[PDB]
Amino acid sequence: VAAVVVVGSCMTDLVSLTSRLPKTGETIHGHKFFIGFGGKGANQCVQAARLGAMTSMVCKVGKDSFGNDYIENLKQNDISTEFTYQTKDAATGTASIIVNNEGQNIIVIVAGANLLLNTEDLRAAANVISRAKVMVCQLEITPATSLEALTMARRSGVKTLFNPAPAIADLDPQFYTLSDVFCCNESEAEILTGLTVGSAADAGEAALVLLKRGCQVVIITLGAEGCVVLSQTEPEPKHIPTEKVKAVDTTGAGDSFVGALAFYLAYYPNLSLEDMLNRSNFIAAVSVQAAGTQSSYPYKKDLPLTLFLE
Amino acid sequence: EVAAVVVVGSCMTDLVSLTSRLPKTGETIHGHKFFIGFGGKGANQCVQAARLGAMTSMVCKVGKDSFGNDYIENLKQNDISTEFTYQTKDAATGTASIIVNNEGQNIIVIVAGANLLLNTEDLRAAANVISRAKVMVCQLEITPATSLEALTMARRSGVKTLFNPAPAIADLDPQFYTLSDVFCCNESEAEILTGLTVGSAADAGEAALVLLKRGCQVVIITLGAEGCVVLSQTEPEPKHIPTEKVKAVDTTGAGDSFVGALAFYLAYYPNLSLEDMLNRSNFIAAVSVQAAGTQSSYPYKKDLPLTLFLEHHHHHH
Ligand SMILES: Nc1ncnc2c1ncn2[C@@H]1O[C@H](COP(=O)(O)OP(=O)(O)CP(=O)(O)O)[C@@H](O)[C@H]1O
Ligand SMILES: Nc1ncnc2c1ncn2[C@@H]1O[C@H](COP(=O)(O)OP(=O)(O)CP(=O)(O)O)[C@@H](O)[C@H]1O
Numbered sequence: 361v362a363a364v365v366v367v368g369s370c371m372t373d374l375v376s377l378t379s380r381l382p383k384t385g386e387t388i389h390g391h392k393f394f395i396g397f398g399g400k401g402a403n404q405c406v407q408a409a410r411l412g413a414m415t416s417m418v419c420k421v422g423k424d425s426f427g428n429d430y431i432e433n434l435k436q437n438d439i440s441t442e443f444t445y446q447t448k449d450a451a452t453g454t455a456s457i458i459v460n461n462e463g464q465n466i467i468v469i470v471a472g473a474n475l476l477l478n479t480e481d482l483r484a485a486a487n488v489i490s491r492a493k494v495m496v497c498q499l500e501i502t503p504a505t506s507l508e509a510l511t512m513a514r515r516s517g518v519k520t521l522f523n524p525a526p527a528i529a530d531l532d533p534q535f536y537t538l539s540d541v542f543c544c545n546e547s548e549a550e551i552l553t554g555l556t557v558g559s560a561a562d563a564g565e566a567a568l569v570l571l572k573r574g575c576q577v578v579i580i581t582l583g584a585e586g587c588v589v590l591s592q593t594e595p596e597p598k599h600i601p602t603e604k605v606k607a608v609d610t611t612g613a614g615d616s617f618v619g620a621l622a623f624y625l626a627y628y629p630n631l632s633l634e635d636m637l638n639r640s641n642f643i644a645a646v647s648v649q650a651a652g653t654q655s656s657y658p659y660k661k662d663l664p665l666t667l668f669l670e
Numbered sequence: 671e672v673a674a675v676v677v678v679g680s681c682m683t684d685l686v687s688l689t690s691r692l693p694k695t696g697e698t699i700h701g702h703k704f705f706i707g708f709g710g711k712g713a714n715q716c717v718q719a720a721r722l723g724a725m726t727s728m729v730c731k732v733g734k735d736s737f738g739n740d741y742i743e744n745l746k747q748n749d750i751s752t753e754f755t756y757q758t759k760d761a762a763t764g765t766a767s768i769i770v771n772n773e774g775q776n777i778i779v780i781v782a783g784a785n786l787l788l789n790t791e792d793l794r795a796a797a798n799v800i801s802r803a804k805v806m807v808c809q810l811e812i813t814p815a816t817s818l819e820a821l822t823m824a825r826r827s828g829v830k831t832l833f834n835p836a837p838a839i840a841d842l843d844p845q846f847y848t849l850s851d852v853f854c855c856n857e858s859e860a861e862i863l864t865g866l867t868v869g870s871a872a873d874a875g876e877a878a879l880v881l882l883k884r885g886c887q888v889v890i891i892t893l894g895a896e897g898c899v900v901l902s903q904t905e906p907e908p909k910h911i912p913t914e915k916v917k918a919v920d921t922t923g924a925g926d927s928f929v930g931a932l933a934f935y936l937a938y939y940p941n942l943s944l945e946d947m948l949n950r951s952n953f954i955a956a957v958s959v960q961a962a963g964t965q966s967s968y969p970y971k972k973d974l975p976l977t978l979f980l981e982h983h984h985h986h987h
């Protein structure tokens with residue numbers, strides 16, 4: 361039985377590495393290009409799977425080469441594709457990513473078949489959703505479809521992990537009240553609250569705003585600074601540091617973090633939040649030490665044993 | 671069997687996203703359409719020549735990857751010889767990632783990739799094709815030393831050299847001028863190359879004379895809707911070749927269409943005046959600007975007035 365069900369996105373990542381970002385009108389040269397398997401949903405599901413979770417990926421890709429390749433990718437990662445659909449009416453989603461090694465990126469998503477995943481497609485997955493431990497959603501599919509997946513999870517007492525990524529300033533208030541765990545990064549927290557986040561302290565203040573919108577637990581990820589967490593029971597923010605490492609490629613680190621979190625909510629439900637986050641930070645930091653997104657996500661066998669004890 | 675037009679240059683996969691706004695640093699935005707297209711100045715030029723009826727050969731390097739295989743098939747679908755289209759496991763096929771807003775402004779990230787690995791040994795194996803051609807066409811999207819060597823090879827074999835210094839760099843090796851029988855660039859490229867402003871046919875004439883005196887035999891500056899301006903060592907007074915008003919849908923790649931047409935005329939209509947060649951090339955590029963999508967807008971002979979293929983002088987097409 362799948363313990364972690366992800367209802368969300370698969371994208372073909374078209375990645376260019378550059379030393380600067382381009383400005384309007386401008387052509388710049390990068391030094392490398394590669395294709396990867398991406399999408400926040402799938403990335404999260406892949407990390408959870410590699411840690412040993414039994415997972416199911418509920419998603420929609422194209423009846424195109426990239427979509428066929430995506431399905432094979434999911435199978436190679438031991439992820440159930442029972443509810444991975446293909447449509448001839450849109451192409452597999454695409455994420456064009458420019459990664460500037462000398463600062464912030466730019467991403468352009470054409471979500472394609474992701475946006476055709478509908479409430480009828482979820483209904484077929486109703487038995488899987490209700491027998492799971494954790495349901496994970498993001499904002500790369502139609503928001504109404506994520507909302508329904510959260511609602512279905514809540515009705516069966518399944519823990520909801522929501523990642524509001526990429527963030528929308530006017531997010532439906534139900535996303536907060538249907539989230540047991542609400543996890544976003546610094547720039548997303550800014551978009552969602554209108555506040556500036558330049559410090560662990562600032563993140564704590566943004567997290568409290570989100571908490572008061574009805575989340576049970578809020579986590580803001582902070583790159584090399586780890587994360588900050590608070591909850592309804594314990595509303596004082598805690599700053600959990602991460603492993604000090606030399607980052608090669610941080611792309612998708614957040615997804616690694618969230619997939620780890622899903623794994624621990626599902627298989628180690630009695631751990632303190634602070635423990636789970638220490639472990640999830642450790643995992644995500646392993647991902648930043650290598651190139652790519654999914655190809656840098658570690659397997660259980662390569663990770664210290666203490667990450668799997670209780 | 672023998673190719674009359676050999677292009678030594680670039681092939682790039684165009685990865686195009688249409689959005690309502692461009693992203694600022696740090697931003698993720700949604701676009702509303704994505705598509706894959708065949709670009710690279712070298713291949714674009716080769717394609718236009720081929721569609722006009724040239725026997726062409728594309729000397730280039732792509733990846734041993736799916737985009738590279740697709741590129742090869744594109745060249746074959748256009749009846750271009752791919753004998754010296756190389757594939758390498760050491761880099762991916764060149765890419766141009768293009769984000770375009772609603773008003774038509776863009777940001778572009780090029781990863782030239784396998785294009786840069788086309789080397790002088792690769793050209794040496796293509797020596798028989800280079801040396802037996804009528805025209806050799808190069809640009810500045812591969813390693814400059816490779817294009818220089820292509821030009822040197824073509825010159826010593828009596829093959830006419832058509833050089834397009836695109837994209838332009840300010841400090842171009844002087845040999846690019848002295849090896850060029852026909853040196854053809856656009857207004858913004860001319861400005862980069864000379865520091866002069868080109869806001870008029872007269873201005874273009876002045877920039878062209880600076881380029882001439884660096885040792886080119888013929889200099890052409892393209893001027894978008896204003897046609898082109900040309901001069902030569904034998905006729906150093908610049909001439910303005912205007913073009914009739916058309917309704918432009920998408921000008922992307924018009925310069926490549928122009929250059930590919932010119933290569934076709936140099937190779938297959940050598941007795942036409944240069945000004946006739948350039949008048950016909952203007953017409954052909956202008957057809958390209960009336961339709962979307964770069965190589966897909968490049969016309970075939972069957973789509974063109976027959977007066978473009980007359981062996982004697984003909985002005986109005
Ligand atoms: N430089 C670094 N060193 C160690 N860990 C890091 C790191 N950057 C990120 N991480 C880890 O990954 C988590 C996710 O961080 P964050 O959400 O900032 O990533 P992201 O996916 O937004 C990065 P990118 O913008 O490059 O895709 C952090 O909480 C931390 O555990
Ligand atoms: N609006 C228009 N109407 C008619 N012909 C046009 C045109 N725009 C371009 N052309 C034709 O295409 C040729 C090349 O145009 P241009 O000078 O724009 O080069 P280019 O395509 O390299 C500019 P860029 O590198 O900005 O895209 C012109 O000389 C002309 O023959």
Ligand code: NA
Nearest residue numbers: 525545614615
């Ligand atoms: Na994230």
Ligand code: NA
Nearest residue numbers: 609647650656
């Ligand atoms: Na990584």
Ligand code: NA
Nearest residue numbers: 836856925926
């Ligand atoms: Na051009």
Ligand code: NA
Nearest residue numbers: 920958961967
């Ligand atoms: Na066009």
